[PDB]
Amino acid sequence: RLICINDYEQHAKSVLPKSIYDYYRSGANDEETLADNIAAFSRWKLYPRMLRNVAETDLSTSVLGQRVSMPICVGATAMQRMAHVDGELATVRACQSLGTGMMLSSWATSSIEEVAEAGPEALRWLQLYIYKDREVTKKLVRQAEKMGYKAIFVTVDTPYLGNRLDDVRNRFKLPPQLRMKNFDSGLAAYVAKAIDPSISWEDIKWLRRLTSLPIVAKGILRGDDAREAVKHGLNGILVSNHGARQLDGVPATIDVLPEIVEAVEGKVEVFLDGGVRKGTDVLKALALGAKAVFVGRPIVWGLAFQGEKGVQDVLEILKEEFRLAMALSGCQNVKVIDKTLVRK
Numbered sequence: 342r343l344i345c346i347n348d349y350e351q352h353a354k355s356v357l358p359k360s361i362y363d364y365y366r367s368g369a370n371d372e373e374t375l376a377d378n379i380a381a382f383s384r385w386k387l388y389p390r391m392l393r394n395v396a397e398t399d400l401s402t403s404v405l406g407q408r409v410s411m412p413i414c415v416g417a418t419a420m421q422r423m424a425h426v427d428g429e430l431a432t433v434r435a436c437q438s439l440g441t442g443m444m445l446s447s448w449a450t451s452s453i454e455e456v457a458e459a460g461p462e463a464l465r466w467l468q469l470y471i472y473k474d475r476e477v478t479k480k481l482v483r484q485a486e487k488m489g490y491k492a493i494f495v496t497v498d499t500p501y502l503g504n505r506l507d508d509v510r511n512r513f514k515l516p517p518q519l520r521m522k523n524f525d526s527g528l529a530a531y532v533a534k535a536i537d538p539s540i541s542w543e544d545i546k547w548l549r550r551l552t553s554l555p556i557v558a559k560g561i562l563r564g565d566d567a568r569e570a571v572k573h574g575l576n577g578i579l580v581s582n583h584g585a586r587q588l589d590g591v592p593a594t595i596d597v598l599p600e601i602v603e604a605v606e607g608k609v610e611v612f613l614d615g616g617v618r619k620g621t622d623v624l625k626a627l628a629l630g631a632k633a634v635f636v637g638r639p640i641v642w643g644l645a646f647q648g649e650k651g652v653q654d655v656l657e658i659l660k661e662e663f664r665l666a667m668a669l670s671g672c673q674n675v676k677v678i679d680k681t682l683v684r685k
């Protein structure tokens with residue numbers, strides 16, 4: 342049956358209710374950036390070196406000083422219990438098995454404590470939204486700290502929710518038995534009531550003062566903004582267009598990655614998400630300077646197939662495709678993945 346990430350999506354479309362599949366699949370508006378996040382990877386060509394001795398491939402690396410088994414981590418995707426009854430608990434258990442890290446949504450269908458209890462040994466980070474209620478926001482940060490999460494990924498590209506046309510058509514809502522457990526389109530309305538469209542760099546200053554955990558700015562697409570994040574004492578940039586779900590017609594993340602890596606001058610780690618489906622996508626991102634990549638939708642498709650086992654399968658497929666791509670390119674380890682491997 343399922344031997345690559347595309348097969349898991351096709352499986353998920355066959356088993357999920359349409360409204361849930363569309364919620365997960367959709368991009369904003371005409372979905373131009375959604376297509377481009379994938380197409381852009383294909384424009385970057387690989388220039389492999391031969392005869393480098395690749396018997397001993399080492400995929401291991403580090404994210405914000407913490408060791409991981411591979412530069413492939415789980416990104417925040419809301420409401421995972423819609424895909425499988427065990428939701429985020431299935432995901433964290435898979436991450437612990439694989440030795441990689443999980444970024445937990447602020448809009449998870451499982452709580453910060455529940456997830457730390459299901460994956461105590463797993464590397465775990467919290468994705469944070471700035472709620473208009475700063476007390477709620479602070480409590481999330483404090484819970485993350487108490488529960489052994491290792492970083493905060495603050496999402497900065499969502500002052501309002503993007504317009505995903507299928508969600509509006511299907512009047513998207515959570516199924517009845519589920520809740521966001523830490524507290525038109527139903528989600529757009531929620532965001533407008535709950536999430537602060539006023540946030541500015543002053544609020545980044547507040548958050549930097551609030552916690553000593555590493556903080557990564559998630560959703561940066563300009564070099565100037567990346568340089569402002571470095572100025573504010575943040576510890577990494579996640580180059581992201583929010584899975585093409587926010588402003589449509591922004592570039593692919595793999596296309597803006599080199600500008601952001603250049604802009605930060607090595608002062609903080611730069612990560613990428615958006616369109617990662619294959620081991621060669623991971624290799625291209627690392628050649629262009631990313632430390633690691635995050636995967637969103639592929640994880641949800643793994644849950645839809647088989648909960649924890651299906652998440653483990655998806656991560657193992659990406660791991661083995663990445664191993665093979667490194668080997669065929671002449672790369673023994675991630676430290677030797679260099680800029681001459683790629684050209685557009």
Ligand SMILES: Cc1cc2nc3c(=O)[nH]c(=O)nc-3n(C[C@H](O)[C@H](O)[C@H](O)COP(=O)(O)O)c2cc1C
Pocket residue numbers: 364365366378416417418419446447448449468496559581582583584585586614615616617635636637638639
């Ligand atoms: C169904 C879905 C739910 C998402 N939920 C969140 C969220 O709660 N918080 C967040 O910051 N980003 C959210 N994202 C954005 C993801 O963190 C990530 O940027 C994106 O999925 C990466 O692209 P990919 O799906 O092509 O791998 C979501 C993405 C999807 C597809």
Ligand SMILES: CN(C[C@@H]1CCOC1)c1ncncc1Cl
Pocket residue numbers: 395396397398664665668
């Ligand atoms: C044994 N494998 C997996 C290959 C993938 C195709 O057939 C076997 C590897 N082991 C060490 N370094 C790299 C690789 Cl790709």
